[PDB]
Chains A and B, each alone.
With several copies, the nearest count.
Chain A
Amino acid sequence: LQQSLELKRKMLRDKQNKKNSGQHLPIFPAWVYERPALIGDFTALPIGTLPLASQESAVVEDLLYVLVGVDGRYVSAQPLAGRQSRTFLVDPNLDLSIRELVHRILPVAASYSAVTRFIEEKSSFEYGQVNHALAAAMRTLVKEHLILVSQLEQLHRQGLLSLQKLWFYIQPAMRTMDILASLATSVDKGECLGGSTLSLLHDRSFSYTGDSQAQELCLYLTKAASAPY
């Protein structure tokens, strides 16, 4: 988690020695990186005695928190947000059949954290113009995830939504967050920046010549992140 402070230190010195032919790159105030700002996740009843129908009805609102990065009431995010992906703490006394369905959904939440964090980091001036433009087209699609996880609460307040409906409705979202969180973590490991990320996007714009839904993502993100270059 912490080492990004050092990476930004190495980076900005290197942007300076590339720009030895110039001076005065911008930089953000430290509060932009120290505050929790845009990051994801951070006395309840005897749920073992809460009966099976209501037990689902209690769990399904926590998913509507956890899909945007809020620690729920059951099914709450873990510390060591570090490395490259989240894990979560669904309770030992929730019904086993419900737990194995909850663990099937969370890989969109585990993959929402770790996309907010690529929208934050790869926007500051250490990272060239192309990582900004990528991390902004990626910022747009994260609004539509917030529209969607809002619709699902409207259906929930009407008593009208339930876990097998929820697992129908999230499926085109769960796809896009896998595509994004993969195309994010691939830019951190393959740490190189503009010109190279503009390759990495185009390579996956062939790798998905079949899937079509994920193929429009990679043509969108590339046609967006193209423009500065």
Chain B
Amino acid sequence: ITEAALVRDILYVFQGIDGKNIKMNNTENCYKVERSLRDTAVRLSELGWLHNKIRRYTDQRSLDRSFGLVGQSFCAALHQELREYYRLLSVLHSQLQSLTLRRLLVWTYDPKIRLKTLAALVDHCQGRKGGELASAVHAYTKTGDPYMRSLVQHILSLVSH
């Protein structure tokens, strides 16, 4: 096994899909592998677990018209604000034929702090609908840091419409 191998898999597991040596434990607890390499791989793969959880939700609560206009228009934002995360992850699929950057700890950091927020705004919104879901999305615009507070103030303009 080599450090060059592990960074191949680590490009697919940022996209929810499995890899040649990274796999899964049982399902949606964690991304357990198969040294110190392993530990930095694990710590990166916790961006995959945050992708599945936000992908599935927009794949189901769109294609369910019962979930209403808000609900759909939310799942549109969680698709747009995730297509731009595939834009990033395309350049990292290129740039093979070095790349490691502590096996990417400084590339992924800025969006993993945006893959959080949304995965918690999903679980805070779960079960609501209608203009009540335009309230859970207004619960999180009351926080200090203009990353989360501006990311969530965009969704509270899509979901306002």
Contact = CB atoms under 8 A, between A and B. Distances in A.
Contacts of A68: 40, 102, 105
A215 to B, nearest CB: 10
Given A129-B144, A136-B144, A143-B109, A150 B102 contact: yes
B69 A165 contact: no
Interface string B54-79: 00000000000000011011111000
B26 to A, nearest CB: 16
Interface string B76-88: 1000000100110
Interface in B109-125: 109-110, 113, 116, 120, 123-124
B89 A70 contact: no
A164 B83 contact: no
Nearest to A172: B83
Interface string A196-229: 0000000000011111100000000000010110
A26 B36 contact: no
Contacts of A130: 144
B46 interface: yes
- Which of B36, B73, B101 has the most chain A CB within a 10 Å cutoff? B36
Contact of A70 (B39, B46, B143): B39
Given A146-B106, A164-B90, A211-B72, A28 B145 contact: no
A32 B35 contact: no
Contacts of B83: 168, 171
Given A129-B144, A132-B144, A164 B46 contact: no
- Which of A62, A209, A210 has the most chain B CB within a 10 Å cutoff? A210
A132 B86 contact: no
B134 to A, nearest CB: 13
Contacts of A65: 36, 40
B76 A70 contact: no
Interface residues of A, number: 54
A1 to B, nearest CB: 19
A24 interface: yes
Contacts of A70: 36, 39-40, 43
Contact of B124 (A26, A62, A146): A26
Given A70-B39, A132-B144, A210-B72, A29 B90 contact: no
A136 B147 contact: yes
Contacts of A99: none
A150 B101 contact: yes
Interface string B88-102: 011001100000111
B109 A26 contact: no
Interface stretch (A35-43, A88-96, A183-191): A35-43
Contact of B86 (A125, A133, A164, A227): A164
Interface of B: 35-36, 39-40, 43, 46, 69-70, 72-76, 83, 86-87, 89-90, 93-94, 100-102, 105-106, 109-110, 113, 116, 120, 123-124, 135, 139-140, 142-145, 147
22 contacts: A65-B40, A68-B40, A70-B36, A70-B39, A72-B36, A73-B36, A125-B143, A129-B144, A130-B144, A131-B144, A132-B143, A135-B145, A139-B113, A143-B110, A146-B102, A146-B105, A149-B102, A153-B100, A165-B94, A167-B90, A168-B89, A210-B73
Closest CB pairs A-B (n = 5): A210-B73, A132-B144, A136-B145, A133-B144, A26-B139
